[PDB]
RNA sequence: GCGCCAAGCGUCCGUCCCGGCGGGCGGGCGCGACCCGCUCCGGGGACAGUGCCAGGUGGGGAGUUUGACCGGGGCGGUAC
């Protein structure tokens, strides 16, 4: 094997290195219509849904 | 001072070559860089705030008024 080859590890600690490109899907500033849809699903899980509307979950 | 655009591993290809495996040439994916959980993070919160009515305050502002007689008017008087 070639002795020139080497491991060059980078530690992603606080400071001392630049962070890699990781998934930011949980911290994206989504457009206002995506926010509207997702919050509307949360509201249906958060509020007291009356039985006549809740019976369609089943 | 320097710090990014991955090293290193582990696999999958070639309609590509040279002796099913090997070597060369060019690529792909995964780990490196853990997984799951519904609101980006934090601070308040059914209060603040907004809409409508009710009470107080309000020369900051608006509009108006501030009699008459009278040896001039005013002051004084009322002989109004």
Swiss-Prot record:
The modification N6-acetyllysine is found at residue 7. It comes from the Eukaryota. There is a cross-link at residue 21 (Glycyl lysine isopeptide (Lys-Gly) (interchain with G-Cter in SUMO2)). It is found in: Cytoplasm. Component of the large ribosomal subunit. The ribosome is a large ribonucleoprotein complex responsible for the synthesis of proteins in the cell. Belongs to the eukaryotic ribosomal protein eL8 family. Component of the large ribosomal subunit. Interacts with CRY1. Interacts with DICER1, AGO2, TARBP2, MOV10 and EIF6; they form a large RNA-induced silencing complex (RISC). This is Large ribosomal subunit protein eL8. The chain holds residues 28 to 85 of 266 of the full protein.
């Amino acid at each position: 094997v070639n002795p020139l080859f080497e491991k060059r590890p980078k530690n992603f600690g606080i400071g001392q290195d630049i962070q890699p490109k990781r998934d930011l899907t949980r911290f994206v500033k989504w457009p206002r219509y995506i926010r509207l849809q997702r919050q509307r699903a949360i509201l249906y899980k958060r509020l007291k849904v009356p039985p006549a509307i809740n019976q369609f979950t089943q």
